Symmetry: C3
């Protein structure tokens, strides 16, 4: 484990995702509202999945070597197995908050799968220049997601209860800022141009992951928007 300088950030990430999972699990014990139960189930699964994948990276299972640039490059593939399941769950939290229609939910989840799937292909591609073709396709899929979150959901939240509109607006802004950083870290990190070393890259993804999952969840599950209007 300790033979890799980035191990400290993988261990911290593992701990923070595990602690986040347990807090949400305990906090959700005393909840019977069927609407609130939906948000607790979605939001608790997110850091639980991330916990297992951070642990796999810490123990060395989620790491492979990819030859490109005449070098064997360490690629943590477990990140994409994490994101494949956690990013659509996070979008479902937002879509259920605004009572989005089914067709829009399917478009979001499908574009998200394309985003993560093409990012994985780009991470494992051995022809250096082709890695950035996949990065560009994946980034186009992300821009579609961000467009929908702004010019489809925002207008839908305003016609909703005030507390669900204000909570959505906050979580929307958090998501757009944090998610946009991921393609940048990829491009300048060891998967892309190799400007930033792997140990610093790992620290950046850990800060982003914890903020986008645990921080996101703390804002959502403390809001009254997750409960139905009741007397």
């Amino acid at each position: 484990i300790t033979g890799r300088p980035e191990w400290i950030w993988l261990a911290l990430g593992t701990a923070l995702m595990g602690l986040g999972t347990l807090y949400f699990l305990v906090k959700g014990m005393g909840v019977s509202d069927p609407d609130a139960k939906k948000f607790y189930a979605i939001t608790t699964l997110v850091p639980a999945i991330a916990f297992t994948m951070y642990l796999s990276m810490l123990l060395g299972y989620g790491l492979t070597m990819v030859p490109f640039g005449g070098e064997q490059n360490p690629i943590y593939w477990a990140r994409y197995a994490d994101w494949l399941f956690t990013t659509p769950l996070l979008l479902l939290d937002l879509a259920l908050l605004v009572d989005a229609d089914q067709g829009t939910i399917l478009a979001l989840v499908g574009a998200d799968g394309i985003m993560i799937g093409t990012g994985l292909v780009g991470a494992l591609t051995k022809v250096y220049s082709y890695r950035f073709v996949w990065w560009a396709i994946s980034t186009a899929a992300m821009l579609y997601i961000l467009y929908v979150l702004f010019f489809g959901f925002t207008s839908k939240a305003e016609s909703m209860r005030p507390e669900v509109a204000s909570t959505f607006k906050v979580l929307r802004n958090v998501t757009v800022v944090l998610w946009s950083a991921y393609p940048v870290v990829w491009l300048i990190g060891s998967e892309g141009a190799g400007i930033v070393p792997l140990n610093i890259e790992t620290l950046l993804f850990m800060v982003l992951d914890v903020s986008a999952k645990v921080g996101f969840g703390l804002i959502l599950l403390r809001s009254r928007a997750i409960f139905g209007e009741a007397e």
Copy 2:
């Protein structure tokens, strides 16, 4: 790329799926009917997924070598990753058109997963004679799907609006004819008996894919069956 004679058909397929995706995306911009939005989302995702997998084959990522018959045989595995997601989406288009019940939808999607999954196992199997055992199981799963589309959905469409009944009947006939060709191309192509060479096999799958996805989508999204009855 150009070192493979089949590259021209992979490049054409990539272009036609990309163009198809963009047309459906633009055409769906001016749509607010929640029913129509469902069909546009399903139908636009189909060629978008196929685009990415054709590109992976063009660039050489979606290709592996499988030893059988005393030879290293080029097997494009990316086809099955495509079909795993696009064939159930196409069946969902048909099932939603006739307002099929949930139990029937699950049976269709499950049989479809078995069809594609066993076809993938057959494509990667190293014992030559066993490849055709998997082909037979996969073909049995397809025949179940075709039976349901005829002796379960057809009777359901007649009790529906006339425009949804006539549109379903057309898309049903297109699907049964085109899908039935796939097991035949597999059997006589490089995955099976090896009668037809890979470059011709690739041309045939490209014609079938574009027809079953883009051609299918053009018929559906030009129909009024996708809109609810409104004044």
Copy 3:
């Protein structure tokens, strides 16, 4: 095939899953109740999936070698591909029986995916002591599932029709007893401590699989709880 002593139990399992699939398929022909159709579709898919994965193990495709303990250990990975899809389908049978809320269904299916996913990682892990870390995480996920089936569903079934309450109680008890045996067989078998040899381990999993899928299905599909109350 016959070069492996466990082949006899893989062949028996294949036959019993295939026969089970055909019986459920025939029995479900004469069913039009939309509620009953749901249970028949879920319950017939379970042994059909298991059939294909037992066949892959029989023919040698679903087997790999994992080095640990200074030895190349035969690991049947196809079991986890089976369980990944069949265990959530079995939980869906139970959840639909008691009309569970959506949030609870998602929590069950998500915990089940974590259970199977971490068990697969543990089966393929090359550092011997780490294999049991994954076993423990997977077992914690199972205990969560069992808790929900007892202290969330049981109370919900009592407020239901008497026949659905008594049928659920029976299937609940069958599930908790049979599922609990799996982590024990893993721990003492070739994936874990290696006390029980592989051929005996394979026999035990076959008895458990057939009972948990075909036996489970025979109890459910003979009950009147799967039909709506009708005159």
